[PDB]
Amino acid sequence: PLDDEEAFEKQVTS
Amino acid sequence: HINLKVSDGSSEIFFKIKKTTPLRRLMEAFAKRQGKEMDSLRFLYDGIRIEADQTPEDLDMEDNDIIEAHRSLPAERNPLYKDDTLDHTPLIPKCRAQVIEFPDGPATFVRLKCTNPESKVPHFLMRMAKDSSISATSMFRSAFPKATQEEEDLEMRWIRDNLNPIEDKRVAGLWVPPADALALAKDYSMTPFINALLEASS
């Protein structure tokens, strides 16, 4: 949830 | 009384006011002749944002000094970008490539993490590998964490009018080509960061 890869994905598709 | 030149890069207008009058009078003078509202602009003198209540005597203004006129931007800028001249080279290996699976197939992005002083969630400058487009929204929110939604909506409206916006419902935010991204980097004082994001491997 707070990892770089997961946070970046939610930032581009929300 | 002194003569003052006010320019927004395209049009220069010369004024004359006494050193004890508020500079808002000279701000409203220039803004009225541009067809813009005074709040829609901000004025710089030696890189210092002039406030309305200040006077030519409050600063050390002489005759023929130039006051740069720019569009308004949020007040509290990210302290990470207090220097636009930092060498971009050590920032490139911090950029990371990442694949994201979409309904129509995978797409490769390049991300650069930037410290947000107002939240624990990591913020990233994002670049799409296919067209090197950069999200103007991620640039604005990184440089102005305490911005209001109205302040953002006015900026994105300025991006669509003055730059080349690319918007797709499958990918959030407003995206601009690399040329426009480096122009926004000059306004946001993000040149070393955008310069490294464009030079990073995809």
Residue numbers in the entry:
A (entry chain B): 4 to 17
B (entry chain A): 11 to 212
Paper text:
Bqt4 is one of the most abundant INM proteins in fission yeast Schizosaccharomyces pombe, and plays crucial roles in chromosome-NE association by interacting with different protein partners. The Bqt4NTD comprises six α helices and six β strands arranged in a compact α/β fold. Overall, our data suggest that Bqt4NTD is a protein-interaction module that recognizes a consensus motif.
Bqt4 interacts directly with a telomere protein Rap1 to tether telomeres to the NE. After extensive screening, we determined the structure of Bqt4NTD-Rap1BBM complex consisting of Sumo-fused Bqt48–140 and Rap1498–512 at 2.7Å resolution. Rap1BBM forms an α-helix and spans on top of the β-sheet composed of strands β1–β4 of Bqt4NTD. Notably, the loop between α3 and α4 was rearranged to form two new β strands (β5 and β6) upon Rap1BBM binding. The interaction between Bqt4NTD and Rap1BBM is mediated by a combination of hydrophobic and electrostatic interactions. Two hydrophobic residues of Rap1 (F503 and V507) form a hydrophobic core that fits snugly into a shallow groove formed by β1–β4 of Bqt4NTD. Rap1V507 makes intimate contacts with a hydrophobic pocket formed by M63, V108, I37, and F39 of Bqt4.
